[PDB]
């Protein structure tokens, strides 16, 4: 037993991380088969980032202006292409450590592991959520650009995120591996509104089910509610509206615990209205929304990768 | 910027995990050079665990009664030895993936990464603390025994923990890699008192410094205090006494932020006495004690491994 915010084992991704240098700028790349993927802003100076013309900046770059190092190994760049906000550097060597992999664009509220890297070297791994407003709350210092987010299903790495920007508000923005930003963000050093964020209701309910399974049940109450009644409370507390699709995804946790999803909703309503009264749930004094229903089932059933 | 509970990259440890089977019992082992390390209770049935005579149980086992599988690879066991609560199985093949490594016995309040494994397969990685009472609050299901805790310093893995037991209270107990339990625990299915736990004061102060660096400064107050005055408050709230060694370890964070350690102590006193008044610090509604001063410096300065 016990419940922890757990990242995927990072070894399959560690083997793909490289350093990319273009003139004065160094950041991280992702070496898969004979292609290195990195943020296109590797071609910018500090001054360029105020208002970059990426097409004009990239035209002044040749294959030989991209230095790619895999630990000690120097890779030879034989092609370059810009796709949306990513650069694809064709190299003459297929990465011998390339795992089975897919590129996926995740939905708001989904979770993934980040391997934070500097100079192509991994520093640490943590689990987070794509916020409803398409930001992430990460730990990213100067040099972390090109660090990637991923999920693992047995032996297959699904890459969903590449780190590009810290907004002036201190939250983080990036792209899928086709270089399309999540949310309205652009790769320019400018004021950018993230927009109202909401709490991921279906995740909070999943984590309340994890709490019950682990013996934390003080918050289970006498009451039930309806989808429309609960959603009136969701609106007032800036929670995502609960849909029947969300109820259906919670079905397996409802079955295991014998607690109907709308009964767990009435428990959550009472917590939103009355607060936690100085108590904790799974070691937290607030309502946690960075576990998906799938996360809770995985952790609670000990599922494995390789 | 941003601050997250970050685990070490797990790839160097993933390459060392194996499945160990002795009759009916399967758990995890750690393959380093030509030695596999696992919990000695791999030789017990459910019934044995009530009151095992490990010396008598092990005498009935030969080399060929230990099945060791490294993914698809079957290893040949050519020796077995019991050291304290661990079994050392000599195998005929040195692990080709053996990283540079040390065995360390950590101090209460120190942190480490756990690679949770089932059937010799890694499922996830998380950071935790050795509690002052020598328990850990992990996520460990049936089959997780033999999962290991570790730190990494550049290219060297320091193994500090091997998982052995869940206490009836749902907290976790284990050994160093010489098989010596942390705390008073034994590898027997019996009622075992963990003893009063305390909060790791020096860690809470480190995390308050991380908060200030990241812009969370609402809790910084008008007051200072003394070591003896603060320790009177520490006693009342079940916090570890602060010593001058703890002050000295906090020196670099005091220097970076310009906040004297005793001034940060008076901030912490006010939080202990008045609570958080429904506010948060680095996304937490309680006082976090699973970051060491070294953890905060590492994360805040982007230090790297390989």
Resolution in A: 1.8
Q: At what angle do helices A201-213 and A261-274 cross, to 10 degrees?
A: 100
Is B11 close to A8, i.e. CB distance below 8 A?
Answer: no
CA distances (Å), origin A260, targets A28, A257, B297: 46, 9, 46
Please choose, from the candidates A114, A208, A155, A147, the residue with its C-alpha nearest in 3D space to the C-alpha of residue A12: A155
Q: Which bin fits B47, alpha (ψ -120 to 50), beta or left (φ > 0)?
A: alpha
Q: Rounded to the nearest 5 degrees, what angle is found at the Cα of A281, between the Cα atoms of A275 and A285? A: 50
Tokens 């790769």 belong to which residue? A187
Count of C-beta atoms within a 10 Å radius of residue A47: 9
Residue in A closest to B300 by C-alpha: A141
CB A267 within 8 A of CB A225: no
Q: Which among B1, B115, B305 has the least Cβ separation from residue A170?
A: B1
CA dihedral A20, A22, A25, A26 (to 10 degrees): 10
Mutate to test the interface with B, among A69, A123, A144 (most CBs of B within 10 A): A123
CA dihedral B158, B159, B161, B164 (to 10 degrees): 180
Asked if B170 reaches chain A (Cβ–Cβ under 8 Å), the answer is yes
Q: Is A41 a known active-site residue?
A: yes
Asked if A142 reaches chain B (Cβ–Cβ under 8 Å), the answer is yes
Residue in B closest to A128 by C-alpha: B4
Q: Give the helix/strand (H/E) hosting B41.
A: none
Asked if B3 reaches chain A (Cβ–Cβ under 8 Å), the answer is yes
Q: Which among B117, B171, B305 has the least Cβ separation from residue A121?
A: B305
What does DSSP assign to residue A188? S
CB A271 within 8 A of CB A235: no
Is A4 close to B138, i.e. CB distance below 8 A?
Answer: yes
Is A138 close to B2, i.e. CB distance below 8 A?
Answer: yes
CB B172 within 8 A of CB B197: no
Residue in B closest to A165 by C-alpha: B1
Asked if B191 reaches chain A (Cβ–Cβ under 8 Å), the answer is no
CA-CA distance, B200 to B129, in Å (whole number)?
Answer: 9
What residues have CB less than 8 Å from A171, skipping those under 6 apart? A131, A135, A136, A137, A194, B2
Q: What is the 3-state secondary structure (H, E, C) of A240-278?
A: CCCCHHHHHHCHHHHHHHCCCHHHHHHHHHHHHHHCCCC
Is A125 close to B4, i.e. CB distance below 8 A?
Answer: no
Q: How do A111-118 and A86-91 pair as beta strands?
A: unpaired
Asked if B172 reaches chain A (Cβ–Cβ under 8 Å), the answer is yes
Is A10 close to B9, i.e. CB distance below 8 A?
Answer: yes
CA distances (Å), origin B296, targets A234, B3, B8, B243: 36, 9, 14, 19
Alpha helices per DSSP H over A156-226: 201-213
Distance between B139 CA and the closest CA of chain A, angstroms: 4
CA-CA distance, B91 to B43, in Å (whole number)?
Answer: 18
Burial class (CB in 10 A: 0-12, 13-18, 19+), A157: buried
Q: Based on C-alpha coordinates, what's the Rg of chain A?
A: 22
Is B305 close to A122, i.e. CB distance below 8 A?
Answer: yes
Q: Based on C-alpha coordinates, what's the Rg of chain B?
A: 22
Q: Rounded to the nearest 5 degrees, what angle is found at the Cα of B51, between the Cα atoms of B49 and B52? A: 70
Is A9 close to B10, i.e. CB distance below 8 A?
Answer: yes
What residue ranges define each of the domains in chain B, with the CATH number in brackets? 1-14+100-197 (2.40.10.10), 15-99 (2.40.10.10), 198-301 (1.10.1840.10)
Q: Which residues of B touch A14 (CB under 8 A)?
A: 9, 11
CA-CA distance, A221 to A225, in Å (whole number)?
Answer: 11
DSSP per-residue letters across B80-137: EEEETTEEEEEESS--TTPPEEEE--PPTT-EEEEEEEETTEEEEEEEEE--TTS-B-
Name beta bridge partners: A68.
A20, A75
Q: Which among B124, B137, B284 has the least Cβ separation from residue A9?
A: B124
CA-CA distance, A86 to A95, in Å (whole number)?
Answer: 19
Q: Is B164 a known active-site residue?
A: no
Q: Work out how many CB contacts closer than 8 A connect A with B.
A: 160
CA-CA distance, B206 to B109, in Å (whole number)?
Answer: 12
Q: Give the helix/strand (H/E) hosting B293.
A: helix B293-301
Method of determination is X-ray
Is A125 close to B304, i.e. CB distance below 8 A?
Answer: no
Catalytic-labelled residue, pool A16, A22, A38, A41: A41
Q: How do A156-166 and A100-103 pair as beta strands?
A: parallel
């Amino acid at each position: 037993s016990g419940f922890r915010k757990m990242a995927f084992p990072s070894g399959k991704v560690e083997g793909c991380m490289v350093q990319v240098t273009c003139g004065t700028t160094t950041l991280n790349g992702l070496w898969l088969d004979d292609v290195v993927y990195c943020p296109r802003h590797v071609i910018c100076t500090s001054e360029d980032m105020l208002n970059p013309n990426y097409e004009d900046l990239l035209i002044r770059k040749s294959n030989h202006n991209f230095l790619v190092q895999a630990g000690n190994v120097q890779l030879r760049v034989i092609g370059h292409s810009m796709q949306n906000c990513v650069l694809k550097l064709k190299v003459d060597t297929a990465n011998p450590k390339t795992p089975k992999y897919k590129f996926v664009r995740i939905q708001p509220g989904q979770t993934f592991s980040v391997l934070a890297c500097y100079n192509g070297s991994p520093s640490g791994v943590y689990q987070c959520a794509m916020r409803p407003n398409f930001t992430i709350k990460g730990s990213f210092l100067n040099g972390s650009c090109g660090s990637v987010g991923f999920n693992i299903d047995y032996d297959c790495v699904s890459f969903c995120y590449m780190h590009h920007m810290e907004l002036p508000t201190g939250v983080h923005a990036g792209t899928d591996l086709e270089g399309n930003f999540y949310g309205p963000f652009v790769d320019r050093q400018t004021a950018q509104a993230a927009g109202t964020d909401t709490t991921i209701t279906v995740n909070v309910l999943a984590w309340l089910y994890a709490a019950v399974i682990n013996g934390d049940r003080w918050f289970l109450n006498r009451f039930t509610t309806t989808l429309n009644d609960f959603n009136l409370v969701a609106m007032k507390y800036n929670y995502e509206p609960l849909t029947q699709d969300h109820v259906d995804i919670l079905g397996p946790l409802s079955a295991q615990t014998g607690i109907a999803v709308l009964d767990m909703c009435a428990s959550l309503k009472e917590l939103l209205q009355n607060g936690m009264n100085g108590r904790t749930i799974l070691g937290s004094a607030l309502l946690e929304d960075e576990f998906t229903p799938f996360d809770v089932v995985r952790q609670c059933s000990g599922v494995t990768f390789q």
